[PDB]
């Protein structure tokens, strides 16, 4: 029921989106997981560059 | 004699009886605390004659006679000795008042300190 000059909005919430909500509380832990594996990758190849070829 | 206030005006109050909530006499679950009647057909809300009175702004006391005791002082809560010296410039129109949580061991020390600074205490002998 639109009233007095809003945009015609089309929210894509008609599916059961609450079962498939992806939270991003893993972001700081994933950054540590990627970083601690990045340092460990660079220590196995001691003289080689960390970025690769 | 005691510690008299600096000025003693005639304290007048427009209404001294408490404001009673509607139908609190009939029921027990309705407390004495006032609630505004917001019904569609209520005798209290539209001010029918011979009913209870609703609290309005006109029942407010004069700004000069507000918040004094019958003795003529304003209350101020006191916890310890350190908060007693702040009233050293207000002892002629303000009284010290001791909290319920003050132990009897240091309650006596506040009372005799208030005598030295000539500050009235409304509860000088509470715990003894």
């Amino acid at each position: 029921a639109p009233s007095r000059n809003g945009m015609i909005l089309k929210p894509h919430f008609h599916k059961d989106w609450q079962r498939r909500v992806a939270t991003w509380f893993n972001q700081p832990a994933r950054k540590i997981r990627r970083r601690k594996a990045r340092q460990a990758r660079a220590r196995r190849i001691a003289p080689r560059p960390a970025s690769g070829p | 004699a005691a510690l008299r206030p600096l000025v003693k005006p005639k304290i007048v109050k427009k209404r001294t009886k408490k404001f009673i909530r509607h139908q609190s006499d009939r029921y027990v679950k309705i407390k004495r605390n006032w609630r505004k009647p917001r019904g569609i057909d209520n005798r209290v809300r539209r001010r029918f004659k011979g009913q209870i009175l609703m609290p309005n702004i006109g029942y407010g006391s004069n700004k000069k006679t507000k918040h004094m005791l019958p003795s003529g002082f304003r209350k101020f809560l006191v916890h310890n000795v350190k908060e007693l010296e702040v009233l050293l410039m207000c002892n002629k129109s303000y009284c010290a008042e001791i909290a319920h949580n003050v132990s009897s061991k240091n309650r006596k020390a506040i009372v005799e300190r208030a005598a030295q600074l000539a500050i009235r205490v409304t509860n000088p002998n509470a715990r003894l």
Binding site: N5, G6, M7, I8, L9, K10 | -
Partner: protein
């Protein structure tokens, strides 16, 4: 009883600024005293304009200040603005200026000082001209916001040029039945 319409009894003008900052209130404190003591009506407008909201005192472009200060008569004259001074990139030459404002952007500040100008604050304005003598009061475009293009007469009304509220501009989202002579009607 008295038959008085009480719906317009309370005026809706501003009394105190809604900001909780202390530098603006000190400037309000300074100009509160000058408004009710001095006979200068300039200080009353500044005090009135120091109560406005952020969307109410629009930024003043630098080139509009140059355009409005090159008028004949106002030479050796200071310009006082209540909003903010912002740089304009489409102006090349800038003369010597004397500008007073609450805030000047860093790019516009270095441009005025390079040309030998002078940027003052409103506390130094009271020390220079407490009555505001020899001052020019300017302001930015009040209707220059994008918000005001959605106001006025409603769209879908003949001889109305209001921007509609559209999520994104495309060929098939609008300009159809209601806008085309081929599709139903147009206004």
């Amino acid at each position: 009883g008295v038959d008085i319409r009480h719906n317009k009894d309370r005026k809706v003008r501003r009394k105190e600024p809604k900001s909780q900052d202390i530098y603006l209130r000190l400037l309000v404190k300074l100009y509160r005293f000058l408004a009710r003591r001095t006979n200068s009506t300039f200080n009353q407008v500044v005090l009135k304009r120091l109560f406005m909201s952020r969307t109410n005192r629009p930024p003043l472009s630098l080139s509009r200040m140059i355009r409005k200060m090159k008028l004949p008569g106002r030479e050796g004259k200071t310009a006082v603005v209540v909003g903010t001074i912002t740089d304009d990139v489409r102006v090349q030459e800038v003369p010597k200026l004397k500008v007073c404002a609450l805030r000047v952007s860093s790019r516009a500040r270095s441009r005025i000082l390079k040309a030998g100008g002078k940027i003052l604050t409103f506390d130094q304005l009271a020390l220079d001209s407490p009555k505001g003598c020899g001052t020019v009061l300017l302001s930015g475009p009040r209707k220059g916001r994008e918000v005001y293009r959605h106001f006025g007469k409603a769209p879908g009304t003949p001889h109305s040029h209001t921007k509609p509220y559209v999520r994104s501009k495309g060929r098939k989202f609008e300009r159809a039945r209601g806008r085309r002579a081929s599709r139903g009607y147009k206004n």
